[PDB]
Amino acid sequence: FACKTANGTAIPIGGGSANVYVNLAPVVNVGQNLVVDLSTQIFCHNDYPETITDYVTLQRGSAYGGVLSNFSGTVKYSGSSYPFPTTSETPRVVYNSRTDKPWPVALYLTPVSSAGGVAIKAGSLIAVLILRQTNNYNSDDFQFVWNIYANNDVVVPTGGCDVSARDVTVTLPDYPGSVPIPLTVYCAKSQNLGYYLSGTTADAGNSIFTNTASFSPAQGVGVQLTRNGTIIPANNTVSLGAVGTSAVSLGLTANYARTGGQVTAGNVQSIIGVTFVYQ
């Protein structure tokens, strides 16, 4: 039972366990969200088929780890899908020739939020897969673990909907200008969606936000978002209606807002977070 990664790195055997680095391409689907498909990037074979007909199974206890350790889903395995983490030993995959074939596994996630996502960083842990090997012949049984690491930075969605970008930067033209904000929302199934604005407001109406400039800050001027002329205060929901696979622009615009009397030139900055809620 030899193996190697997508980048050609042979996965060591000889120590009880291993570290594996793979490329993650999460995508939102209906009911499930894909995390990683190891059919693309793990290839195993049998260097001495005449002498053995190996089997491999995903022993119970295999689970998400690292930052995903609290999540649950399913695992595609050898022709069928089972719940994940595994409460029981799965059926047996068979390796009986020197020719490589993929490790037919893929990990899914049961949505637990609206939009939302947890940021994976390269060199982090993804999941711990307890594996059990056996054979036709030598009355000989082993177990070994593969720690699954991501070698590329991604964000793993946890809701039924995704957005164009997680971090967005918009450069206001000089006072008193405004700009459109390129944000859009799409959902794999026809869903309702709203959103409310999170940030450190500055005013009594909670509609304007304070400057955060760390260098020669301007004073008396704060940001104020609006959609088609609607002032969208903080901690308030604005509904998108029914959202499907067609991405919907939030309709947000970024403005200046005059707070507290006289003004002084200088930089201006404000960081805003958008949260989505099912409706």
Binding site: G116, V168, T169, D174, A218, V263, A265, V268
Partner: peptide
């Protein structure tokens, strides 16, 4: 705050 927005501006 599953989406974070950075607003950059200046006054002169």
């Amino acid at each position: 705050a599953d989406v974070t927005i950075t607003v950059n501006g200046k006054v002169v």
